[PDB]
Structures are given as C-alpha cells and as structure tokens.
Amino acid sequence: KKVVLGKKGDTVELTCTASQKKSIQFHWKNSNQIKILGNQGSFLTKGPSKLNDRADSRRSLWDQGNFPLIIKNLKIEDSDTYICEVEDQKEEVQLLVFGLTANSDTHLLQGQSLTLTLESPPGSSPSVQCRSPRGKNIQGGKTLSVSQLELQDSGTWTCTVLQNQKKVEFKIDIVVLA
C-alpha cells in the first residue's frame, strides 16, 4: 500500500483520508499497535512513544475527512508500517526513511575516490542514481564510489533513489581543489 520515502533529517506527511461524515474519531499507530496520536474528544492526543516530541497532526482538516501524521527529524529507525484507523476504516502506510551521506565529508581534493553511502532502514536494500553536473553517474547502493576526481565538481550532484514504486533525491554539493 502507501509507500512513502523520507530523507534523513527532514519532515514527512502521510495521508489518511476518511470516507465518513466529516470530522471524526481516529488514530495513528505503528506496526506494533503502540498508539502515536489520536484525539481526546475534540483535541489531539499524542501518546508517550519515542516519536512524541516530534509527531503531530493537522486538526483543522479533521473537518474535511483528513487526518495526517506529521514527523519531524526523520531518523532511519522511523521506518516501519504505520496505520491509520478512521472509524471503521483501516489504512496501511509504510515509511522508508533514506539518508544519503558523503563518506568523506562532502569535500575533496583534485584526484581521490569520492564515497557516498545510503544508510537504510530495518527492511531494505536501495538503488542509487547519483548523476553529476558532468552527466555520468555511479551505481549500486549502500556505498557507490568513484576512483579519481576531475576538478569540475565543486557544483551540484543529483542523487535519486526509488523504493517500492516511489522515489526521492539527494542533490548534493561536492568540492574539488588543484
């Protein structure tokens, strides 16, 4: 069902739209049924889980049949199936948080292998397509690599990743001396 991918550090918003009579009783949970957030009657109630100080909702839409789940500071461990339950309707949504980093420090001199990675979640091995201002790209996933570094690289590289029919991209900055 809903595959939604996030970028480590940034926020995401999953969707949960109801088929009811506008604005009702609902809640979001994680794979194991520990409640994340819902509604003590008319307002929002977030449990005590590991995501409380960073989980949220938009109660203004609990009027037009929508109950989202907002998460800030995306951690890769934040990945797992979340479930929304709006009255008699259940809705599965898997979150895959991906983080692309520069196993160097995102800087480099003129001539040495540049290594990135892609730190994955509890349930995945992903595919990377990092282009570069200079057309080409590398492949693989968990670690990519290069070999030598042609000085025309202190610009913007582009880095896409697509999971279970869905995609995200980490456009990065690289630096090359002389």
Swiss-Prot record:
- GO molecular function terms listed in the Swiss-Prot or TrEMBL record: coreceptor activity; enzyme binding; extracellular matrix structural constituent; identical protein binding; immunoglobulin binding; interleukin-16 binding; interleukin-16 receptor activity; lipid binding
Record annotation: effect of changing S60R = Increases the affinity for MHCII
Q: State the disulfide connectivity.
A: C16-C84, C130-C159
Substitution effect: F43I: Abrogates the interaction with MHCII and T cell activation
The organism's superkingdom is given as Eukaryota
- Whether Ligase counts among this entry's keywords is no
Q: Which UniProt keywords apply?
A: Adaptive immunity, Cell membrane, Disulfide bond, Glycoprotein, Host cell receptor for virus entry, Host-virus interaction, Immunity, Immunoglobulin domain, Lipoprotein, Membrane, Palmitate, Phosphoprotein, Receptor, Repeat, Signal, Transmembrane, Transmembrane helix
What does altering D63R do? Increases the affinity for MHCII
Q: Which residues form the Ig-like V-type domain?
A: 1-100
Q: Where does the record say this protein resides?
A: Cell membrane
One of the protein's GO biological processes: symbiont entry into host cell
What kind of modification does the protein receive after translation?
A: Palmitoylation and association with LCK contribute to the enrichment of CD4 in lipid rafts.
Q: In which tissues is it expressed?
A: Highly expressed in T-helper cells. The presence of CD4 is a hallmark of T-helper cells which are specialized in the activation and growth of cytotoxic T-cells, regulation of B cells, or activation of phagocytes. CD4 is also present in other immune cells such as macrophages, dendritic cells or NK cells.
Q: Which GO terms describe its cellular component?
A: clathrin-coated endocytic vesicle membrane; early endosome; endoplasmic reticulum lumen; endoplasmic reticulum membrane; external side of plasma membrane; membrane raft; plasma membrane; T cell receptor complex
What broad class describes the main subcellular location of this protein? Answer: membrane
Report if keyword Phosphoprotein is assigned.
yes
Residue intervals of the Ig-like C2-type domain: 101-178
Noted disease association is: Immunodeficiency 79: An autosomal recessive disorder characterized by childhood onset of recurrent and recalcitrant skin warts due to uncontrolled viral infection with human papillomavirus (HPV). Some patients may also have recurrent respiratory infections. Laboratory studies show a complete absence of CD4+ T cells.
Subunit architecture: Forms disulfide-linked homodimers at the cell surface. Interacts with LCK. Interacts with PTK2/FAK1. Binds to P4HB/PDI. Interacts with IL16; this interaction induces a CD4-dependent signaling in lymphocytes. Interacts (via Ig-like V-type domain) with MHCII alpha chain (via alpha-2 domain) and beta chain (via beta-2 domain); this interaction increases the affinity of TCR for peptide-MHCII. CD4 oligomerization via Ig-like C2-type 2 and 3 domains appears to be required for stable binding to MHCII and adhesion between T cells and APCs. Interacts with Aedes aegypti long form salivary protein D7L2.
Recorded domain comment: The Ig-like V-type domain mediates the interaction with MHCII.
Annotated function:
Integral membrane glycoprotein that plays an essential role in the immune response and serves multiple functions in responses against both external and internal offenses. In T-cells, functions primarily as a coreceptor for MHC class II molecule:peptide complex. The antigens presented by class II peptides are derived from extracellular proteins while class I peptides are derived from cytosolic proteins. Interacts simultaneously with the T-cell receptor (TCR) and the MHC class II presented by antigen presenting cells (APCs).
Name of the molecule in the record:
T-cell surface glycoprotein CD4
Organism field: Homo sapiens (Human)
